[PDB]
Symmetry: C4
Subunit: 99 residues, 4 copies
Amino acid sequence: CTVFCTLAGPGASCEAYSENGIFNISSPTCLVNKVSEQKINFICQRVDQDVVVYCNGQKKVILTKTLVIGQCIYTFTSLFSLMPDVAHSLAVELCVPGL
Amino acid sequence: CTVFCTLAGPGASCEAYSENGIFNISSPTCLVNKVSEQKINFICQRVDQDVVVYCNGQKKVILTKTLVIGQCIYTFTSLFSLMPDVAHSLAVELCVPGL
Amino acid sequence: CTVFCTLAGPGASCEAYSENGIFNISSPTCLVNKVSEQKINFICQRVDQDVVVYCNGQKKVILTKTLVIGQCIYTFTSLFSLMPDVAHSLAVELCVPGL
Amino acid sequence: CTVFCTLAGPGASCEAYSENGIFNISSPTCLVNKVQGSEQKINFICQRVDQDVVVYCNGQKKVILTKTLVIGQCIYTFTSLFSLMPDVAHSLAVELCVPGLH
RNA sequence: UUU
RNA sequence: UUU
RNA sequence: UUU
RNA sequence: UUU
Ligand SMILES: *[C@@H]1O[C@H](CO)[C@@H](O[C@@H]2O[C@H](CO)[C@@H](O[C@@H]3O[C@H](CO)[C@@H](O)[C@H](O)[C@@H]3O)[C@H](O)[C@H]2NC(C)=O)[C@H](O)[C@H]1NC(C)=O
Ligand SMILES: *[C@@H]1O[C@H](CO)[C@@H](O[C@@H]2O[C@H](CO)[C@@H](O)[C@H](O)[C@H]2NC(C)=O)[C@H](O)[C@H]1NC(C)=O
Ligand SMILES: *[C@@H]1O[C@H](CO)[C@@H](O)[C@H](O)[C@H]1NC(C)=O
């Protein structure tokens, strides 16, 4: 399915989403273990290891690096927020390595 | 139908609300798709394009610029939070173009 | 009942809670309208006016000033967070007018 | 059961989780009170964290110290500060924030 | 200041 | 420090 | 920029 | 680094 997480304290807050429904979902690092909703919210207490979610038979890995890139965008968007027409695009340009 | 989002990492965390219930909702860029509940919470993994949400036969467009204006208000409210009587209105005055 | 909100972009993210269940809840400025569970979460798009909630025939007002005090505590706890034994109480001492 | 909280305004936003289901959960300060299978997880808030987070869940007393919540916010804060170096930001923040760590 |  |  |  |  699709997994989206943002940082929360020392860990992460996540959503799993599948348009046709989430039938099973588990994680070695996060508090989710269920075997039909299309959205499931869960947390990960630490992100020392990357976020690993098994969802509908598919292994998903959201790297902690990827989470930090997303936090970078949030932080620099806020820093530039008196220029609201350009803040988000400026933050993406600074924060995403391969651009 | 009302849509409200705040920034979350690289994207947005959102709610769609309709007092008499949401009968259908979709988005080209956000994780929501329904073909009756008052409230639906969903996320948008990116806001490089503005948040476009279809709800109850209406096209809703929340500009990323509008989301950054709201983040500006949050950020400057916190900056000024030792002056809790005026911090919010000061933040609105700085952050909302025109005022 | 009990109402607790924190700041979210230009507005607030809130919860109402009542030990014996929430039978009625509404608000002139927040997206909540029910006419039975212990807890409901709702958002307020703006806090230019204080957050006013009617819950179980009781009128609840959380002042924006109060919200900002709470955000002060959050912000200065983060600022002092390399001293985790005293960061929270230090933030309360700086941020709460009656101390 | 398991309890994880992060700071929210003057208090905390929390989640409790038990693999076999949460049947009883209460708190001397947080807004949670359930008695009676049932759901694996419940979200609740605490309006203040002056006196740590104490949760009675499935007969066991859980205490998440405010100090621990602040270490966690330290990691969030320094990860953000270091976020232009996304390969190392989290590890750096842990190294700085977790007392005694080497 | 979510239109 | 949500009254 | 959640793969 | 939620014990
Ligand atoms: C959650 O809390 C409740 C109450 O605090 C616990 O209820 C307890 O349940 C056991 C059996 O499941 C009760 O024992 C039974 O007592 C009756 C007489 O009242 C007897 O006829 C039965 O044969 C059995 O011995 C126990 O009395 C009851 N406790 C109280 C205070 O009423 C429940 O077990 C808790 N669940 C978890 C997972 O902690
Ligand atoms: C989503 O639901 C709305 C609400 O019922 C639909 O709106 C009406 O749909 C009927 C069906 O064709 C039309 O005759 C009306 O003119 C519509 N009214 C309005 C105000 O939109 C809408 O068609 C539905 N759309 C989708 C894509 O499901
Ligand atoms: C809601 O319930 C209360 C308590 O029963 C009642 O007094 C009130 O009239 C109801 N409606 C509103 C709008 O408060």
